[PDB]
Amino acid sequence: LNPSARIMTFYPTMEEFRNFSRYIAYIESQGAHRAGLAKVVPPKEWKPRASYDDIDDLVIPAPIQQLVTGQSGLFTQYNIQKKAMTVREFRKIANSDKYCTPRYSEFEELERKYWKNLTFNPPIYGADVNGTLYEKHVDEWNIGRLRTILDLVEKESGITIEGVNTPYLYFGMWKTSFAWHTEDMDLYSINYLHFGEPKSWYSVPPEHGKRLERLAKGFFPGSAQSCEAFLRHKMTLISPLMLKKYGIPFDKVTQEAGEFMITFPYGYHAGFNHGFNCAESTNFATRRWIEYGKQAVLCSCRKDMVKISMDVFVRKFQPERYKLWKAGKDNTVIDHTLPTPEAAEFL
Amino acid sequence: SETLNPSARIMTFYPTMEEFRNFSRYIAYIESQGAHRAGLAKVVPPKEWKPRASYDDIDDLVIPAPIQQLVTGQSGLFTQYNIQKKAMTVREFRKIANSDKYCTPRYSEFEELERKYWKNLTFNPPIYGADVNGTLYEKHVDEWNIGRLRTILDLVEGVNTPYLYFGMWKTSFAWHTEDMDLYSINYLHFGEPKSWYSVPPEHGKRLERLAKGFFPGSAQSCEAFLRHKMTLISPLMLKKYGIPFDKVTQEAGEFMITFPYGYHAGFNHGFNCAESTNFATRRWIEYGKQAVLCSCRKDMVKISMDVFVRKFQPERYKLWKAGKDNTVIDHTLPTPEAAEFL
Amino acid sequence: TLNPSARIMTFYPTMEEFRNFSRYIAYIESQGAHRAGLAKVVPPKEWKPRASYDDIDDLVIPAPIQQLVTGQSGLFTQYNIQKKAMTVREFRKIANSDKYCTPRYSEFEELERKYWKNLTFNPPIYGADVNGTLYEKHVDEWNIGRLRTILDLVEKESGITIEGVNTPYLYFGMWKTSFAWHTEDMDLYSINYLHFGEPKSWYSVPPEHGKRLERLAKGFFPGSAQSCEAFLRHKMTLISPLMLKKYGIPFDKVTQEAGEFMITFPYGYHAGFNHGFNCAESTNFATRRWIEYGKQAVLCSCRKDMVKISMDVFVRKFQPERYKLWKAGKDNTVIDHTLPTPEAAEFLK
Amino acid sequence: NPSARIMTFYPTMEEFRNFSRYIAYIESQGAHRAGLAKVVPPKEWKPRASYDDIDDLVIPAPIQQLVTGQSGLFTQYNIQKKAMTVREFRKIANSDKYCTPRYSEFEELERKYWKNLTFNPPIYGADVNGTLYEKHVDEWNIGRLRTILDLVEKESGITIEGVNTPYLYFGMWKTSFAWHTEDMDLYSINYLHFGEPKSWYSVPPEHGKRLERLAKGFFPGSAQSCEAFLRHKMTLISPLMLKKYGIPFDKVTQEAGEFMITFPYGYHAGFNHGFNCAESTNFATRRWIEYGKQAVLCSCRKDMVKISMDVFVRKFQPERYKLWKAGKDNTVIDHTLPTPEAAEFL
Amino acid sequence: XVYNTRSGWRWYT
Ligand SMILES: [Cl-]
Ligand SMILES: [Cl-]
Ligand SMILES: [Cl-]
Ligand code: NI
Ligand code: NI
Ligand code: NI
Ligand code: NI
Ligand SMILES: [Zn+2]
Ligand SMILES: [Zn+2]
Ligand SMILES: [Zn+2]
Ligand SMILES: [Zn+2]
C-alpha cells in the first residue's frame, strides 16, 4: 500500500550478477529494500547445479508437520517433529492425493485455498536441512559462501550459527508456510528456489514493521506478554485480509524455481509453498545491517535463540561509536528508506 | 442373552455397599443385566464409599508429560495431535485450567456445552494432564481399587497399573477401544464432568468402516489406525451415517466401565481428575485373541495371549496356536462369571 | 493257599483273555493277585491304545507341581507347589535337561539308591492330575476312559463326576517324581497304563498288612495323625523301603515299563517314583468285592473337598439284603483281604 | 575389619527423636560400611503399650518355608497356607514340633539352624500389612519415617507395600529370610516388637558384588534366568560357605525392642529364634539415590518392585539429570562414603 | 519424533 513499498524484480546480466554484495548495493540504490522483499531473476545461462537427480536419497533429519490453529485470518502454527525421511519419501507424500496442490487457474485462487484450508490436513515441511545444493565450484551467488561482512561472526568470533551463516535447505509441499517474521538479528536473507512449485511471499515494508508487530501484539496479547519478540518464534500467521483490514501496507510476490528472493533488514515476510519444491537459504549482511543488528529486538523467552555479538561489527565499521555504543549511549535512529553505503557507487 | 438390554443403551448401576464390595463379581453382575452391550456403563458407588478422604493434598502431584491437544479438521471429522509439554504440578495445571484463557464456557444445558465443544475443538488448544502413573486412592481402600483390581489381567507375563488424568475444558479422548480390546475402569475423583460417547460392540465394525472411509490414508498405513487415539468423530457425523451410539456424562464420584471392543470417545467439561486402568474377565480372552492390533509401531501395547489360552482354554491351545481357533465372538453374551446372576 | 507270599504277580493275557477287562480282573484275583495289593498286566504285543504320541507336544499340563521333599532317615513329607500351565513339549525339555534328567546307573538298585539319596534335592516337576486320555476312540479293550466296571454307577445313577476317579488322569513324570504312600480314594481299585517313556517303580504293601503301615506311619507322623484320621490320603508321606524293612512291614517292589498296566487293589498301599520322562494314564475302578471296602474306607476328615462316594446305591444294588442293617449301622462285616471277588467264581470252578 | 563390623548405637531420647538425622549420624560413625547396624532405643521409648490385644490379628498369607539343598547352599520355597490368626500362629510356633530347640550358647542355636534348615518347615507369618505402633508416637514410626523416599508417593501417590508402607512379620523358630538387598537397594528399618530374637548376617556393601558372583557360581541356572535372582529372596548360604570363599560378613542378634538398620546394597540374611513379631519398611537418604540409579533389578518377574528414579534425580541431582537420562552418568559409588546429610558430624 | 502411551501417540518435539 505505497508506490515505493512495492516488491521489485531484477534481471541482472551475468556481469552484473557476479559480485553479489555489489548487486545488493545496486538494488538498494534502486529502492528495492523499501519493500522489504525483492526478487532477483538470475541470467538464463547461470545454474548452481547441473541436475537434481542425485538428491532423492538425501535425508531430511527432522521433517515438521505444520499444525495450524486459528480463525478469522489469525493463526498459530505448531511444528510437530516427524520421523526422518528422504526427499523420495517426502516427494511421494507431497505428490500424493492428500497433500498435492489443489487444482487452480490463477494464483489468487490458490491463495484463497491456502487461507481457507490452512488449518486442515497439516502438511509436512522438510525444513532447516543443513547442506547446500550448490556445486562447490559456483562462485556467483553461492549461498554457501556469499563472502559478506556477516562472515566476521565465524571468522572473528568462531561461532557457527546453522541457517544464519550456513546454508539451509527446505523441501516444501502444498500449504507448507513460513510465519510472519524478520530474520534473526534483523539480517538480510537470501532464498533460492532450486526446483519445483513456487513459493508465494508476503512482505511488509520495514517502515511499517513496527505497525505489524503492534497489530500482532494486539491479537496475541498472551504471547506478547510472555515474549516481546514473540513473532521470532515463527508461529504467527496473519492473512492478507487482516493486514488490509488494519491498514498494514503489504505486497505479495510469487517465487518460481530458479529465482532468488532477497529479504531486507527488518522486512517482515510470510508465505507458503504451492507444492513440492526445494529452496536453499541463508542470512547475510551489509554495512547498513550493522545498525539493525544493534537495535534488533530479540526473543527473551528462549535461551537457545540466535543472538550475534555486534561488537566486532561496530568496532570495525563504527569505531568512532564503539565506546559510545558500549556505554549504551548510541541513540541512532534508523532510516529504513536509506540505501546501504556500498550503494554510493550507484548514486 | 439377546433379551437383556436389547436397546444396547448405556446402563447406570447404583450398587449398595455389599453389592459394590466385590468388583469382579459386580462386573459380572452388570454383564448379567446386559450392560456390556452398550460398550459403556456407569456405576454409582454408595455415597458412604470414598477412595480418598479429601483432594487438598494433590497440588504437589507432578504431571511429567502434559500434552497440548492440537485438533485439525472440519465437518465433524478431526485428527488430534498430542504435543508433549514441559512437566508441571497439579497446582500449576489447575491454575491454567481455571484461567480465563482455558476455563469452561458459560452454559445452561449440557447440549449447549457439547455444541460449544464440537464448535471450538480446533481453537485454543488445551493441555491434558494425561497418562500420569499414579493413584489418588488411599492404601486402605480395598473396593474398586483401580491400582489393584486383581483381575485375571494380572496374569500378563503396565496395562493393569493406575493412571491419573487431569483434564481441563474440551480436553478430548479420541474414538478407540482399549488396548487388546480390554476392559476399562475410569473413576472421576473430583472436578467437572467427563462426557462420553460409545458405540455398542455389536456395531463397532460399522464405526471402523466409517472411520476407514473418512481417513483412507491412515487406514492404508495401519489397519487399526484408530488405536493411535488421534481420530475424533462428532456424534452428528455418526448419526448422519446411522451408526448407533449413546452418550453419557460422568460426574465426580462415578465409575465408567468400558467393555471389550467398546468404541468410546469424549471430552472433559473442565478441570477434573480421573483415574483409570484396564482389566479383564474371562470373556475378554477371546477378544484379546482376536483384537486387531496396530501394525505400524514397534512400541504398541501387545499382550501375549498364550498364558490365557493355556490356563483358560487348554483344550483349544493347540488349535489356537495352529491359527485354526476360529471362534466367533457373540458380543451380547455375558462373561461366564455372570452365571450366578442368570 | 493262593499267593501265600502275597507277591506282585505279572500277567501276560492273550488278546482273547485281554478283551473283557472286568473279567480279567476277576481272573487275576482268582490267582491271588490282589493279595500283593499291586499286580502288573502286560498286554499282548498286538495291542496298542494309540497309534503314535507324536501329536501331543502342545497338550497343556494345567497344574504342574514342583515336588519339594523334606525329611531324613527314610521319612519324608512331599509338598506340591503348583506352577503355571506348561505344554508337554516344555515339560519334556525340562525333564530331559541336564538338571533334571535321569542319572547314569548300572542296575535298578543303583537308581533306587539314588532316588532315596537325592529325594530332597533339586525338586522335580510332575505333570500330574491332567484331565484327559491318550486312548484313541476305537479302542474297546482296557480303555481307561470306559472300563465299564460297577463304579460307573456313581456317574450313571448318582450323577456324580470325580476327576481322576470316574474320569481318566494323565501324568507326565520326570526323574525322581514321586507318588506318596496311599490307597486309592474310597479304597478303590486303580488302573495305571504307562503309555511311553521311562519306567515307573512301585512299592506295594499287601492289603492284609495295610493297617501295619498305617500304624507305623501314625507313629512317625504323630501330629499329622492327630490332625486327620487318614492323613496318608493327603499323599504327602514318603517312607523308604528300608524303613518298612526296619519295622517289619511286608512289601514288594515292581518296575512298570512302557506299554504295561499296573492294577492296585482295594486297600493296597503303594508308592513309587518315575525313572525319567514318561506319560501314564490312570483311573479308579471297582468290583463287587470293593463295595465292602467302600463302606468301610476310613476317610480324610480334615478337608471339606476330599473324595467321598455315597455307598448307598451300591449296597442297594449288590447287597440288597444288608442295606437296612448297614443303614442301621450294625453291619459289622469283616473284610478278608485274601478272598477273591465274587466274579472270580467261574475261574475257581 | 572393625571398620566394616556391625555397630550398635544407644541414642539418648533427644537424639533419637529425629530419625533421619540419627541415620545421618550413625553413617558419620561408619555404620553403613557393615551394611547392617543396631539401634537400641531409649528405655523410656515404647512404640506400643501392650501386645496382648493382637491375638485376633489375621495373617492373611502365612508361608510354610520348604528348604532344599546341602553343603551350606539352599533354596527356600514359600508355600502359602490358609490364613490364620496370631493366636493360631503362636500356638503352632510355641508347640512341641515347632518350638525353639534347647541351647545354651547362641552358636549352638546357629549350628542347629543350619543343621535342621531343610527339616520341619516352619510357618512364617510374613508380609502382613499393618503397624503395631500406637497412633501418637512421633519417633521412629515405621508407618511415617518422613524420609525422602516419601517423594515418590508425594509426586505420584503410588505406594508399594512393605517399601513405603509398614509390614509385620510373625516369626517362629527357624523361619529365615534369604540373602538379599532391599528392593531398589534401599535402606531398611526393622523393629523387633516382642518375642524371641532375630539373628542377622550382613555382608559389607564393599564386598556385596563378591557375594553376587559367589551366588552366581552356585546357582548358574538361576543366574541365567534372572540378572538379580537373589532378589527372589530364595537363596540361603551358610556362614561357613561365605568364610570358605572369603566373603567378609558379620553376624548380630537383634533382641526384642531393638532396631536394625539395613544400608543400601547391604546383603543380609538370617533367622528367627522363636515366636516373635517384627515390623519393617524401607526408607532412603540422599546417598541412596545413586544406588537407586545403579540398582540391578529382577528382570524375570513383572511383580518385582521398581521405583522411578526421575523424581529423585531431577530434585537432588539436576546437574547430572541430562546425562543420566542420556545414559552418560558414569558415577562410581564409594560404599565407604557417608550420606551428605552427615556433614554435621564430620 | 513420537512414542506410544496409554492415551495415544504422544509427540515429543
Ligand atoms: Cl495470546
Ligand atoms: Cl487419511
Ligand atoms: Cl508329625
Ligand atoms: Ni525468512
Ligand atoms: Ni479408554
Ligand atoms: Ni495310586
Ligand atoms: Ni531385608
Ligand atoms: Zn520468545
Ligand atoms: Zn498403527
Ligand atoms: Zn485329612
Ligand atoms: Zn528375577
Side-chain angles (χ1 to χ4, degrees), chain A residues 3-13 16-43 45-46 48-82 84-102 104-105 107-146 148-154 158-216 218-224 226-243 245-302 304 306 308-315 317-322 324-325 327-328 330-347, chain B residues 1 3-8 10-46 48-94 96-105 107-108 110 112-138 140-211 213-219 221-222 224-297 299-323 325-342, chain C residues 1-44 46-47 49-83 85-92 94-103 105-106 108-136 138-210 212-214 216-225 227-303 305-321 323 325-326 328-329 331-348, chain D residues 2-13 15-45 47-81 83-90 92-95 97-101 103-137 139-145 147-153 155-215 217-226 228-301 303 305 307-309 311-313 315-319 321 323-324 326-327 329-336 338-346, chain E:
Chain A
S4 287
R6 280 171 70 160
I7 301 157
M8 305 171 190
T9 308
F10 295 88
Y11 297 82
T13 66
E16 301 177 301
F17 193 64
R18 283 188 195 288
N19 187 343
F20 167 73
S21 309
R22 188 173 168 209
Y23 200 70
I24 297 296
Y26 165 63
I27 58 180
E28 290 213 353
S29 78
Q30 306 285 115
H33 61 293
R34 287 191 69 185
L37 187 62
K39 186 148 89 186
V40 170
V41 184
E45 45 271 27
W46 179 89
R49 184 188 188 89
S51 186
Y52 298 99
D53 291 338
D54 27 32
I55 74 165
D56 265 83
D57 310 304
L58 182 64
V59 182
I60 294 152
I64 285 300
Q65 191 155 42
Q66 294 185 320
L67 264 73
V68 186
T69 181
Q71 60 190 316
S72 301
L74 300 172
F75 311 93
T76 301
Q77 183 176 261
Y78 294 86
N79 292 340
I80 296 181
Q81 194 171 334
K82 291 294 227 68
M85 45 195 272
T86 52
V87 307
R88 167 179 302 108
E89 312 175 68
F90 189 92
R91 152 143 48 189
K92 168 192 291 221
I93 295 173
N95 290 134
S96 72
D97 284 25
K98 189 169 171 187
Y99 301 103
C100 63
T101 314
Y104 73 110
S105 304
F107 162 69
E108 297 92 56
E109 179 169 26
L110 190 66
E111 184 182 36
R112 261 184 282 100
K113 272 163 178 184
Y114 168 75
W115 289 108
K116 185 198 186 199
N117 300 320
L118 186 51
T119 70
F120 312 134
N121 293 319
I124 294 90
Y125 201 12
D128 301 340
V129 171
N130 284 293
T132 179
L133 289 177
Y134 280 65
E135 293 173 338
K136 303 173 280 285
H137 74 77
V138 188
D139 301 319
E140 307 90 15
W141 286 56
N142 203 320
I143 296 200
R145 48 168 164 106
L146 288 170
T148 184
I149 62 139
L150 185 65
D151 292 347
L152 293 177
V153 180
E154 199 222 12
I159 302 285
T160 192
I161 316 179
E162 276 167 13
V164 173
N165 63 305
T166 82
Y168 262 14
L169 292 166
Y170 292 82
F171 298 91
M173 66 174 64
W174 156 244
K175 271 199 313 101
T176 56
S177 40
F178 47 108
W180 280 105
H181 69 278
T182 59
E183 300 305 294
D184 294 314
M185 299 301 297
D186 294 332
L187 278 155
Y188 289 76
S189 176
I190 189 170
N191 202 284
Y192 180 74
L193 191 49
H194 283 289
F195 63 81
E197 295 288 296
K199 196 189 299 281
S200 283
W201 301 63
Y202 300 103
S203 193
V204 172
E207 297 155 31
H208 293 90
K210 295 289 171 215
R211 159 169 278 95
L212 177 60
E213 33 186 69
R214 206 175 302 138
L215 174 67
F219 271 131
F220 298 94
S223 306
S226 303
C227 182
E228 40 218 34
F230 80 97
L231 289 174
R232 292 203 184 277
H233 310 160
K234 296 178 191 190
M235 304 175 68
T236 301
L237 275 57
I238 298 150
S239 67
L241 291 188
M242 289 306 272
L243 261 44
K245 175 145 166 278
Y246 289 85
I248 304 194
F250 67 98
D251 202 356
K252 59 193 73 176
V253 60
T254 293
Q255 176 192 29
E256 296 197 82
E259 312 194 315
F260 283 98
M261 223 61 219
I262 302 293
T263 280
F264 298 85
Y266 201 61
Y268 277 104
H269 49 277
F272 57 94
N273 295 303
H274 293 201
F276 171 69
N277 59 26
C278 168
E280 185 170 337
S281 69
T282 202
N283 293 116
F284 69 95
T286 69
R287 292 180 43 197
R288 187 164 74 81
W289 162 76
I290 302 180
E291 201 57 37
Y292 288 89
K294 293 157 74 167
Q295 295 189 38
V297 178
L298 310 180
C299 175
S300 41
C301 75
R302 298 164 180 190
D304 46 54
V306 179
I308 304 176
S309 191
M310 299 308 311
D311 290 62
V312 52
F313 289 97
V314 181
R315 211 184 280 113
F317 289 99
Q318 323 176 340
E320 67 279 17
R321 306 209 73 104
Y322 187 100
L324 175 71
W325 164 72
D330 193 335
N331 297 20
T332 308
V333 65
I334 293 179
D335 192 342
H336 298 295
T337 66
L338 298 182
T340 187
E342 302 91 313
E345 164 192 359
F346 306 101
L347 302 165
Chain B
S1 284
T3 73
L4 292 173
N5 195 25
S7 49
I10 295 163
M11 297 173 65
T12 300
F13 294 88
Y14 292 79
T16 71
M17 187 57 223
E18 290 303 316
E19 300 171 343
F20 178 73
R21 204 178 299 285
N22 184 332
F23 160 80
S24 281
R25 193 215 270 271
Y26 198 77
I27 296 303
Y29 165 70
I30 62 176
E31 285 200 17
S32 78
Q33 304 306 296
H36 55 293
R37 288 188 76 180
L40 178 59
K42 179 185 278 182
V43 172
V44 184
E48 45 259 36
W49 182 82
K50 288 174 114 295
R52 188 185 191 88
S54 58
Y55 298 96
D56 39 39
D57 41 357
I58 68 170
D59 286 23
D60 289 306
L61 258 56
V62 168
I63 303 164
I67 47 167
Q68 189 165 37
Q69 298 190 302
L70 304 174
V71 180
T72 173
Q74 60 179 334
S75 314
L77 305 176
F78 311 88
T79 304
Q80 188 184 244
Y81 293 76
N82 288 349
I83 295 170
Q84 178 165 1
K85 307 310 271 167
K86 140 183 168 170
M88 70 194 310
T89 64
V90 170
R91 167 181 301 158
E92 294 165 332
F93 185 87
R94 188 208 325 260
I96 289 181
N98 286 330
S99 80
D100 289 323
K101 199 189 184 203
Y102 294 103
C103 74
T104 313
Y107 78 99
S108 46
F110 162 64
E112 190 180 357
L113 189 67
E114 185 181 26
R115 234 176 291 121
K116 270 164 172 178
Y117 167 78
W118 287 111
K119 174 171 196 182
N120 300 321
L121 187 62
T122 56
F123 314 127
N124 189 31
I127 319 294
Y128 204 2
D131 303 340
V132 178
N133 291 285
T135 178
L136 297 183
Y137 279 64
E138 283 163 8
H140 66 89
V141 181
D142 285 314
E143 315 83 29
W144 287 57
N145 195 321
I146 294 177
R148 46 181 175 79
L149 297 175
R150 310 299 201 205
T151 74
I152 58 160
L153 184 60
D154 286 12
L155 291 182
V156 171
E157 53 179 34
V159 279
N160 74 328
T161 70
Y163 294 85
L164 296 175
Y165 289 86
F166 293 93
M168 72 171 63
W169 154 241
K170 82 185 188 68
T171 44
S172 316
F173 49 112
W175 281 103
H176 69 298
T177 65
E178 298 308 310
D179 290 314
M180 296 303 298
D181 289 349
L182 275 158
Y183 289 73
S184 189
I185 181 162
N186 180 300
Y187 179 76
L188 199 52
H189 283 287
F190 64 81
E192 302 315 302
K194 182 189 299 278
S195 274
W196 298 67
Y197 306 102
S198 63
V199 169
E202 303 157 31
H203 302 116
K205 292 294 167 212
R206 294 168 63 175
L207 182 63
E208 288 178 4
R209 170 168 97 113
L210 189 71
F214 292 152
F215 306 94
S218 309
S221 294
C222 185
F225 83 93
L226 288 181
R227 291 200 182 281
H228 306 159
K229 315 224 209 306
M230 302 179 64
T231 303
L232 276 45
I233 303 175
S234 77
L236 304 190
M237 206 65 172
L238 289 192
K239 214 182 174 196
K240 167 178 290 182
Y241 293 101
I243 301 206
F245 75 95
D246 206 347
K247 54 214 201 184
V248 60
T249 299
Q250 174 191 21
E251 294 202 270
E254 294 186 330
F255 284 101
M256 299 305 296
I257 304 288
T258 84
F259 299 83
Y261 198 58
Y263 273 102
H264 49 285
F267 61 94
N268 295 296
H269 296 211
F271 173 65
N272 58 18
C273 176
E275 185 177 330
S276 68
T277 200
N278 293 112
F279 72 88
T281 64
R282 278 165 59 215
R283 192 166 72 85
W284 164 70
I285 300 166
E286 207 56 42
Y287 286 88
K289 292 159 71 192
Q290 294 189 38
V292 180
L293 304 186
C294 165
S295 35
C296 55
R297 276 205 70 66
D299 64 340
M300 77 155 183
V301 185
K302 181 182 197 308
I303 299 176
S304 186
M305 294 307 301
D306 188 272
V307 71
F308 294 99
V309 183
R310 298 174 173 210
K311 182 165 169 64
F312 296 101
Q313 317 169 332
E315 71 283 354
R316 285 197 271 157
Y317 184 70
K318 187 182 171 192
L319 200 72
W320 170 76
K321 212 187 175 197
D325 185 352
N326 300 322
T327 306
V328 172
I329 292 170
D330 181 346
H331 296 295
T332 68
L333 217 53
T335 189
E337 295 92 319
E340 60 162 309
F341 309 107
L342 285 163
Chain C
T1 173
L2 289 163
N3 195 8
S5 54
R7 283 202 83 203
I8 289 159
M9 296 172 62
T10 307
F11 294 90
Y12 292 84
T14 65
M15 190 59 213
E16 281 304 320
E17 306 164 339
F18 186 65
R19 277 191 214 291
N20 196 309
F21 165 77
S22 310
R23 207 183 170 184
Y24 201 72
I25 299 300
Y27 167 72
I28 66 176
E29 294 216 343
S30 81
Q31 303 302 321
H34 53 272
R35 301 191 56 178
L38 183 55
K40 181 192 285 181
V41 173
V42 176
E46 47 259 39
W47 188 80
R50 187 188 185 86
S52 72
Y53 303 89
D54 289 352
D55 64 336
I56 59 148
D57 282 24
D58 294 295
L59 182 164
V60 184
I61 300 152
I65 49 176
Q66 193 159 43
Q67 295 182 327
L68 305 190
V69 181
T70 173
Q72 54 186 324
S73 312
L75 286 177
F76 311 89
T77 303
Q78 177 179 264
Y79 295 83
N80 293 331
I81 300 196
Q82 190 172 206
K83 302 201 81 209
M86 75 178 83
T87 67
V88 166
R89 187 207 294 100
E90 303 173 329
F91 183 87
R92 188 186 48 239
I94 294 175
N96 287 333
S97 70
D98 286 17
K99 190 183 182 196
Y100 297 104
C101 75
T102 313
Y105 75 95
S106 67
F108 164 70
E109 262 71 42
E110 189 180 350
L111 187 67
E112 184 179 12
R113 272 193 303 280
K114 277 176 186 198
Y115 169 73
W116 293 109
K117 172 153 188 281
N118 299 305
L119 185 51
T120 60
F121 309 131
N122 186 26
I125 300 97
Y126 200 13
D129 301 337
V130 182
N131 276 278
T133 179
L134 290 170
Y135 277 71
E136 289 180 349
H138 58 90
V139 183
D140 302 322
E141 315 84 27
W142 288 56
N143 195 315
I144 285 169
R146 53 167 183 283
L147 294 183
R148 78 186 61 154
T149 73
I150 60 166
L151 188 58
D152 300 61
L153 301 186
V154 175
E155 193 158 10
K156 299 275 228 68
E157 312 282 318
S158 286
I160 286 162
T161 306
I162 318 172
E163 286 180 350
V165 181
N166 280 101
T167 80
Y169 260 15
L170 291 175
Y171 291 87
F172 297 88
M174 66 174 63
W175 154 244
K176 85 181 183 66
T177 53
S178 320
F179 48 111
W181 283 103
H182 71 278
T183 66
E184 300 307 320
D185 291 319
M186 293 298 294
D187 287 349
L188 279 151
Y189 290 74
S190 204
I191 187 174
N192 186 285
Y193 175 74
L194 197 49
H195 285 285
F196 63 78
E198 309 298 347
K200 181 197 296 279
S201 277
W202 305 61
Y203 305 102
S204 191
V205 174
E208 314 157 9
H209 299 94
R212 296 176 61 169
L213 179 63
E214 292 181 3
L216 183 72
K218 286 155 181 49
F220 284 142
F221 302 101
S224 296
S227 303
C228 183
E229 311 192 324
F231 82 93
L232 286 177
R233 295 203 183 269
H234 313 164
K235 301 191 200 143
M236 302 176 66
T237 301
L238 306 176
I239 310 170
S240 84
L242 290 188
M243 278 288 137
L244 301 196
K245 286 192 82 180
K246 178 162 163 174
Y247 293 88
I249 318 293
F251 71 89
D252 203 349
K253 319 178 180 184
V254 62
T255 295
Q256 168 198 25
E257 285 178 302
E260 298 184 338
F261 285 96
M262 297 303 299
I263 303 296
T264 85
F265 294 83
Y267 202 59
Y269 272 104
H270 48 287
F273 60 95
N274 290 300
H275 292 206
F277 175 61
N278 55 21
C279 172
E281 187 175 328
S282 73
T283 199
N284 291 114
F285 73 94
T287 66
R288 285 167 54 207
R289 180 171 83 85
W290 160 76
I291 290 160
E292 204 56 40
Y293 291 85
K295 291 155 74 197
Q296 283 174 240
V298 178
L299 301 180
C300 176
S301 54
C302 74
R303 295 163 177 194
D305 59 355
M306 54 81 49
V307 164
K308 185 170 183 300
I309 299 178
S310 173
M311 295 306 298
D312 305 54
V313 51
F314 288 107
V315 180
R316 294 177 189 291
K317 180 152 191 155
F318 303 101
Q319 315 182 324
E321 85 293 357
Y323 181 103
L325 184 50
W326 166 67
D331 189 338
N332 292 41
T333 312
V334 181
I335 297 163
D336 179 8
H337 298 305
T338 62
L339 296 173
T341 195
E343 299 95 321
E346 54 149 309
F347 298 111
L348 298 168
Chain D
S3 41
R5 284 197 92 248
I6 300 164
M7 306 163 187
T8 303
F9 300 90
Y10 304 76
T12 62
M13 177 59 79
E15 47 195 12
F16 188 57
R17 284 169 168 289
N18 190 341
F19 162 85
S20 199
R21 184 186 186 76
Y22 196 69
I23 296 303
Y25 160 68
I26 63 177
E27 300 233 332
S28 73
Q29 307 294 305
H32 58 295
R33 296 201 72 198
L36 185 59
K38 176 181 283 182
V39 173
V40 186
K43 272 167 182 166
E44 72 244 39
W45 181 88
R48 180 192 184 96
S50 178
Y51 294 110
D52 289 37
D53 48 329
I54 60 143
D55 296 27
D56 294 286
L57 187 61
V58 181
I59 298 148
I63 67 193
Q64 184 145 43
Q65 286 184 330
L66 273 291
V67 180
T68 177
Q70 54 185 313
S71 294
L73 304 168
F74 312 93
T75 300
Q76 184 174 254
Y77 295 87
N78 307 264
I79 298 184
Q80 183 165 327
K81 301 264 278 181
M84 65 180 67
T85 57
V86 168
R87 159 181 305 110
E88 297 166 276
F89 183 83
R90 168 177 57 207
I92 294 175
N94 287 333
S95 82
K97 200 195 183 207
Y98 296 84
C99 62
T100 313
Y103 76 102
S104 50
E105 311 291 41
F106 159 72
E107 286 75 22
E108 196 187 349
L109 189 73
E110 181 187 30
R111 209 172 301 110
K112 272 156 173 194
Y113 168 78
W114 288 109
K115 187 220 187 189
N116 291 298
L117 189 57
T118 71
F119 313 132
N120 258 276
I123 294 76
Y124 197 10
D127 302 336
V128 184
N129 281 280
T131 180
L132 295 191
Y133 277 68
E134 290 187 348
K135 158 160 157 155
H136 288 294
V137 174
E139 314 93 17
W140 288 56
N141 196 316
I142 296 179
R144 48 170 200 269
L145 293 167
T147 78
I148 56 158
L149 186 58
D150 295 11
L151 270 67
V152 79
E153 193 188 1
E155 279 207 15
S156 72
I158 277 300
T159 60
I160 302 129
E161 290 181 356
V163 172
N164 44 45
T165 74
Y167 261 1
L168 296 174
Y169 296 76
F170 296 84
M172 63 168 65
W173 160 239
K174 241 175 52 180
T175 52
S176 46
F177 56 101
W179 283 104
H180 71 280
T181 61
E182 299 303 304
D183 292 325
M184 299 307 311
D185 292 330
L186 279 157
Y187 288 79
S188 146
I189 183 171
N190 187 293
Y191 175 71
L192 190 51
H193 281 289
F194 62 77
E196 295 291 72
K198 193 197 292 289
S199 283
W200 303 64
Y201 301 104
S202 194
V203 170
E206 294 140 37
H207 306 261
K209 235 59 173 161
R210 294 171 57 171
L211 188 70
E212 290 176 349
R213 277 172 237 138
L214 183 67
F218 292 139
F219 302 84
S222 291
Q224 279 162 45
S225 311
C226 184
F229 79 93
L230 289 184
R231 291 196 182 284
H232 307 162
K233 308 190 179 189
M234 302 182 64
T235 303
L236 308 182
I237 305 173
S238 69
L240 288 102
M241 224 50 182
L242 295 182
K243 229 155 195 68
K244 190 192 213 156
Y245 294 74
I247 311 294
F249 78 88
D250 199 3
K251 54 187 71 178
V252 61
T253 298
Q254 163 194 38
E255 305 282 292
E258 239 159 39
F259 283 94
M260 298 301 300
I261 302 296
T262 276
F263 293 90
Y265 202 60
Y267 274 105
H268 52 283
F271 59 94
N272 298 295
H273 288 193
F275 173 77
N276 61 5
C277 166
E279 179 167 340
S280 70
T281 200
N282 290 122
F283 69 90
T285 62
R286 288 210 50 207
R287 187 164 75 84
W288 164 75
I289 289 167
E290 263 304 330
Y291 290 91
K293 293 153 77 173
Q294 281 165 53
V296 183
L297 300 188
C298 167
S299 56
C300 75
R301 300 163 177 193
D303 60 281
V305 175
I307 302 176
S308 190
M309 227 53 39
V311 175
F312 294 102
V313 177
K315 186 145 191 305
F316 304 89
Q317 302 183 319
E319 45 283 14
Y321 192 4
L323 277 66
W324 174 75
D329 200 346
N330 277 3
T331 315
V332 160
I333 308 178
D334 189 17
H335 301 305
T336 54
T339 318
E341 296 79 291
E344 311 171 355
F345 325 89
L346 292 55
Chain E
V2 81
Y3 55 62
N4 185 71
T5 81
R6 191 174 178 270
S7 163
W9 269 15
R10 186 189 296 144
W11 308 82
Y12 58 116
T13 41

